[PDB]
Scaffold this active site. Sequence first.
Site, PDB file in Angstrom:
ATOM      1  N   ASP A  16       0.839  -1.187   0.000  1.00 49.60           N
ATOM      2  CA  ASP A  16       0.000   0.000   0.000  1.00 49.60           C
ATOM      3  C   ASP A  16       0.878   1.242   0.000  1.00 49.60           C
ATOM      4  OD1 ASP A  16      -2.479   1.319  -0.023  1.00 49.60           O
ATOM      5  OD2 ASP A  16      -2.797   1.119   2.138  1.00 49.60           O
ATOM      6  N   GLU A  95      -7.259   5.106  -7.796  1.00 47.82           N
ATOM      7  CA  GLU A  95      -8.558   5.608  -7.377  1.00 47.82           C
ATOM      8  C   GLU A  95      -9.145   6.800  -8.114  1.00 47.82           C
ATOM      9  OE1 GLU A  95      -8.874   5.422  -3.200  1.00 47.82           O
ATOM     10  OE2 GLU A  95     -10.853   6.362  -3.087  1.00 47.82           O
ATOM     11  N   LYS A 131     -10.295   1.896  -8.313  1.00 52.55           N
ATOM     12  CA  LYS A 131     -10.719   2.055  -6.930  1.00 52.55           C
ATOM     13  C   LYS A 131     -11.886   3.039  -6.791  1.00 52.55           C
ATOM     14  CE  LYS A 131      -7.890   1.839  -2.776  1.00 52.55           C
ATOM     15  NZ  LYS A 131      -6.633   1.463  -2.136  1.00 52.55           N
ATOM     16  N   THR A 155     -13.365   0.309  -2.205  1.00 51.41           N
ATOM     17  CA  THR A 155     -12.697   0.760  -0.998  1.00 51.41           C
ATOM     18  C   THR A 155     -13.573   1.514   0.021  1.00 51.41           C
ATOM     19  OG1 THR A 155     -10.647   1.860  -0.232  1.00 51.41           O
ATOM     20  CG2 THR A 155     -11.883   2.905  -2.061  1.00 51.41           C
ATOM     21  N   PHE A 177     -11.561  -1.531   5.585  1.00 52.88           N
ATOM     22  CA  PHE A 177     -10.531  -0.899   6.391  1.00 52.88           C
ATOM     23  C   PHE A 177     -10.587  -1.509   7.765  1.00 52.88           C
ATOM     24  CE2 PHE A 177      -9.061   3.160   4.117  1.00 52.88           C
ATOM     25  CZ  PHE A 177      -9.234   2.571   2.867  1.00 52.88           C
TER      26      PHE A 177
END
Lengths: 316, 316
Positions: A16, A95, A131, A155, A177
């Site tokens: 990440d 994203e 994303k 996400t 998350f």
Amino acid sequence: TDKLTSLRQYTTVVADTGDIAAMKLYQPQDATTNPSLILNAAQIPEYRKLIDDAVAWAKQQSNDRAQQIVDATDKLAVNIGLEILKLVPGRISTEVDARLSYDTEASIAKAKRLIKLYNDAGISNDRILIKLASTWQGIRAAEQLEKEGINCNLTLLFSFAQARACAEAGVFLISPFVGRILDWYKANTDKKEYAPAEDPGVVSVSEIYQYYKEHGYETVVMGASFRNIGEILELAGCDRLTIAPALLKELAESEGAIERKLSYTGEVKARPARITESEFLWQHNQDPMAVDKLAEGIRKFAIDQEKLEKMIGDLL
Amino acid sequence: TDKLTSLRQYTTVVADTGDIAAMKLYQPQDATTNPSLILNAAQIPEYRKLIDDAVAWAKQQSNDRAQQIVDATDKLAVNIGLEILKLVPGRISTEVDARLSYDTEASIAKAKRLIKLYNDAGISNDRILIKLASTWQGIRAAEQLEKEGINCNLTLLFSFAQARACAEAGVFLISPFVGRILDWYKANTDKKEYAPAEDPGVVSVSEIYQYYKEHGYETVVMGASFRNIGEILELAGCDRLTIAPALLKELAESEGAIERKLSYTGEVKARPARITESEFLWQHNQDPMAVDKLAEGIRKFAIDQEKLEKMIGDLL
């Protein structure tokens, strides 16, 4: 061996970050970026060439400054993705503009634009994950995108309603998350210290994992956002896990083998009826944590998009 | 034979000084220095070349006086360590700036800098022991350093809580002071004369030794700071013992063989749960002696670091 090597037996390791140095060090299968990481990546001196390439390419596509800022910010995200793809055998997650999170049609348009930019660089759809935030609108965008050959990474997933809706839309991957869920419970609750197994984020992902496997959902579960290695280890067994360089380093430096925690050994059960918008909104809003965090994540990513546009605008 | 020769059968002899003359005389396996010894070593006329080398090297690394003072003081410590390594087959202990004793991150940084300086001289990590004060912050620094290949010498150890925390962090070596414990009991108690076996420092080290061996801890126990040979003899059997030249001389001049006092002949028992910061602070502060001495040792070493910086600054 070390924890990282031991983790690879059960879980696909994903990095990440937008920094290529970590790709060389930990050899992940895939990599993920987000607007905050792309803004941070833009501050790295080695990435100056990528920014100049973005700006130079934008100016060649049009003479309109408004379009130039948008073209260059998109290109920079794609450029950073291009550098990463040279070092990873898997996929890259890029994203879409978070300001479009509550607009299905704008999200489909933007996703196709990023895909077009990648295609312009010779990269095919099987190496990319678009994303999108897990709002009802992003989910509906993703369902349509998947039908068109564009794979998505849903996400900012926090509630079970989001997980259920994503699975039913047939999306390629979801990113629940873990750390942000813990942040909320640390701020809005009495308990400030949690053991790995009682960590709300871990419990959340575990529940989602079981639900997915139990009903034979092909949607990949990738835990994201971690605050410590305890959360990572307790999720050993999850399809994939996107970890930040700092924690990836901690795993590589800690010796000892780890045991698999997440498994589903039973048979595949029948899938229920599809959740409707009304039921989704009701169930999602029943979760105070998810209400705050989904809204907050979109806001922060939006601010970072604007901060990038600011930077790019000063270079045109 | 003499006491020193007899001691070598059971205990690895280490010299506590920065003076190379003692390395030639007693042939120790390892050697240890600390800020007070490095300041004393700097007064030796033969060491003038080492100081001039430090200053000359510092000025070549930068033109900033602030950095020069820091670079030269570090280099001098490393230079004295280099001279000693030419005469000892084992390790050299070099201590980090004591002013960073309550800062984990600054301690990790400083330790890596000293290691870098030694590496610059061609010396590898297996010949060096980075010395850190045994505060919770130094212990957490050491745990991280060990994972990165840097071996540490956890010094100024006085309480059992420190010993336990060090063992659990997996540090290479610990240096429980013996003489300073005796100093405290001579100053803050009715009894001024103690027999070797009833000496508080000896009893402290003996208890720590048994605890370590009983639970199979690989951490080397090195008794340090002695006031008389009686304390040394009563600790015959301890892994290593760092002795000052004056007492090393007394052992070599006293005839007679000595018997081993410290041993653990039983089986290895199961290790308890790891002590937390709260439990450490509580247990450490229960010990009045350890409260005073840990704080005091850090202060004195800090004053000596500043006194060295003063000396070096007058030469730039």
